[PDB]
């Protein structure tokens, strides 16, 4: 990756840039399908802020296959413990499936962090759970 170098500089303001950058790369380095996306919005009484997020299609293994589920989540600095913001990005030709793990707008339900928080689970472990669950239960199946 060539953007990795620029990625670190893209933040330079996180609580743990090092621990954040390493975690990010580790996720993409293991999946090879995900990629860190940049973003920025206003918050402090209306003031844009640098906030990185994850993007890309994650490999979802089926009974005997493996598709590429689209997802995107905001990577917080380190509060309360991990990024709670999690939603799926369905394409115009995709079809979102309602369930305990999905409402309808692609947003992920369930406490997740509020339930476990051992912590035990890390940045890589987080998506791992979604990958495990989404591995059997189709969150958003597209048309053939």
């Amino acid at each position: 990756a060539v953007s990795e170098s620029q990625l670190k500089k893209m933040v330079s303001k996180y609580k743990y840039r090092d621990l954040t950058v390493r975690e990010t790369v580790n996720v993409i380095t293991l999946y090879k399908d995900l990629k860190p996306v940049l973003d920025s919005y206003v918050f402090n009484d209306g003031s844009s802020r640098e906030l990185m997020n994850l993007t890309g299609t994650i490999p979802v293994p089926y009974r005997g296959n493996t598709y590429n589920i689209p997802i995107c989540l905001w990577l917080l600095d380190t509060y309360p413990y991990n990024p709670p913001i999690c939603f799926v990005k369905p394409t115009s030709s995709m079809t979102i499936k309602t369930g305990k793990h999905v409402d309808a707008n692609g947003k992920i339900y369930l406490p997740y962090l509020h339930e476990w928080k051992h912590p035990q689970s890390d940045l890589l472990g987080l998506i791992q759970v979604m990958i495990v669950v989404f591995g059997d239960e189709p969150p958003v199946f597209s048309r053939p």
Partner: peptide, 9 residues
């Protein structure tokens, strides 16, 4: 690769 997502019913 593309997204598309896994099939279903």
């Amino acid at each position: 690769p593309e997204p598309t997502a896994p099939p279903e019913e």
